[PDB]
Design a protein around this ligand. Sequence first.
Ligand code: HEM
Length: 152
Amino acid sequence: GLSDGEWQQVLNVWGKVEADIAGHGQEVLIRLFTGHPETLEKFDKFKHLKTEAEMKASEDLKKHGTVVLTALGGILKKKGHHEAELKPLAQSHATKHKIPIKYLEFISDAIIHVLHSKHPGDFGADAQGAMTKALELFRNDIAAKYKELGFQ
Ligand code: HEM
């Protein structure tokens, strides 16, 4: 649950992402894969990437970063009223991709890391607080759907 002022902060931060969605999406995925290499194994189309240089050179990885962040942005713009948008993603991630909730924690922290890395000094303490709460709400509503499905 976020206040109006917190949502305003989230959507202000998101304007930074929308100015370069592919570059942000690329770096989020690279941070996830390099920090948590077990996550790479869930992607049949990226498991061939052995080095970060290959990850950086991959145009398909940048494309997928755009898909991921476009979906997240659509959810965030709903300010918590995201049941219709979140349900298919919870279902596909539990039943088809088999993504444990832990990996959604990993990517949430990776988003925070990338924002500080690309906007040092321009991602303030209030903005970090509000973005963190928004990603927690996203993860928590996914977790509720995971429990319904019995997925661990
Ligand atoms: C911010 C969180 C995330 C968002 C919004 C997101 C969004 C999406 C979207 C929109 C798709 C394509 C449609 C679909 O299959 O439902 C996708 C595919 C996928 N997601 Fe996620 N995702 C997230 C986190 C993750 C994480 C943490 C993992 C794994 C560590 C992951 C693994 C996958 C895989 C395996 C695919 C299929 C890729 C394919 O072969 O083309 N997702 N995701």
